[PDB]
């Protein structure tokens, strides 16, 4: 069952070489409510006039993207999303550009971000965190085998589907990396030390981020927090972690080998690869196969009210979509 990965690499290679282009237009969708806002874009709930199906539509202002030096990151995002396929990665359904914007329309995930659930209840139990963690391990195994590094693992980007399973969204920082890359990007709390020290770094930054996610899920706070990003950066590069007293000793152990500044010593990045993680004490009762197949009982199944309910998501203030009458960033996005 590494033949699964061989076929997965061949499909990804084929979808990589010849990418779908311009497969819907704005005026086929009714825009409803913003469901989230980012540094660069915003995502709206959306109803396709012809089938009536609901989607999540990311909108990106081409000019804002050129301003914040996010072009290749934006081309990377689309190219990768259209080229991948895995249960716990959100489907891209359509993409297109008009005079002013890039648009990526994806499956609607109605349970809201892990982030909001987690903040409301403080923390998750260890069996629950474990169940969420397993999905990410499987997903990182998959993406790394395609030489894909993700780079923005965080509660905010993990949406909970109707079966209570994760769907990972926001591939803004996902890059196809042979060996090594250098862009300072990510989210401060989740950044590996390599990135902060402007070192030049590999897929092992995602395993670092995974340790943080699991800490935060089980602690209710991140292992490195302060009021400003540079100060988080100092806490991180110290490599100085304290676990709550209730973390099980298996969890302390896993987290120490994940929250490990020394690359030669970091789980994920070793002779044994991902199996150092999969075969570790704390994941011992995890059925990896039943997880991939979604046959495990989920910690919790979100409140359903209907097609087009957004009670699981916070409210944002709106901004209307202006399309311009003259094209705005031609050759920069020729390939989108």
């Amino acid at each position: 069952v590494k033949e699964f990965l061989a076929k997965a690499k061949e499909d990804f290679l084929k979808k990589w070489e010849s990418p779908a282009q311009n497969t819907a237009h704005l005026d086929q969708f009714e825009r409803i409510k913003t469901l989230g806002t980012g540094s660069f874009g915003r995502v709206m709930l959306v109803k396709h006039k012809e089938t009536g199906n609901h989607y999540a539509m990311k909108i990106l202002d081409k000019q804002k993207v050129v301003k914040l030096k996010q072009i290749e990151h934006t081309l990377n995002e689309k190219r990768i999303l259209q080229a991948v396929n895995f249960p716990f990665l959100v489907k891209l359904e359509f993409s297109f550009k008009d005079n002013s914007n890039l648009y990526m329309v994806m499956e609607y995930v109605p349970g809201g971000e892990m982030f909001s659930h987690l903040r409301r209840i403080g923390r998750f139990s260890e069996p629950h965190a474990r169940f969420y963690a397993a999905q990410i391990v499987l997903t990182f195994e998959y993406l790394h085998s395609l030489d894909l590094i993700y780079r923005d693992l965080k509660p905010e980007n993990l949406l909970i589907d109707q079966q209570g399973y994760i769907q990972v969204t926001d591939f803004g920082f996902a890059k196809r990396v042979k060996g090594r890359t250098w862009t300072l990007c990510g989210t401060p709390e989740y950044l590996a030390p390599e990135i902060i020290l402007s070192k030049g770094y590999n897929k092992a930054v995602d395993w670092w981020a995974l340790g943080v996610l699991i800490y935060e899920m089980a602690a209710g706070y991140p292992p490195f927090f302060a009021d400003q990003p540079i100060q988080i950066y100092e806490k991180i590069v110290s490599g100085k972690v304290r676990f709550p007293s209730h973390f099980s000793s298996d969890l302390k152990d896993l987290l120490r080998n994940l929250l490990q500044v020394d690359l030669t010593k970091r789980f994920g990045n070793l002779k044994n690869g991902v199996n150092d993680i999969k075969n570790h004490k704390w994941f011992a009762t995890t059925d990896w196969i039943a997880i991939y197949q979604r046959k495990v009982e989920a910690p919790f199944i979100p409140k359903f009210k209907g097609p087009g309910d957004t009670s699981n998501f916070d409210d944002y203030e709106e901004e209307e979509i202006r399309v311009s009458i003259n094209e705005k960033c031609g050759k920069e996005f020729s390939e989108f």
């Binding site: 989230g36 905010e156 989210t187 401060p188 709390e189 209710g220």
Partner: peptide, 20 residues
């Protein structure tokens, strides 16, 4: 408590990606 410390910090909302 550390959580008490976390709750009173100024980083308890959605966190944004870093720019440059």
């Amino acid at each position: 408590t550390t959580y008490a410390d976390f709750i009173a910090s100024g980083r308890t909302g959605r966190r944004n990606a870093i720019h440059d």
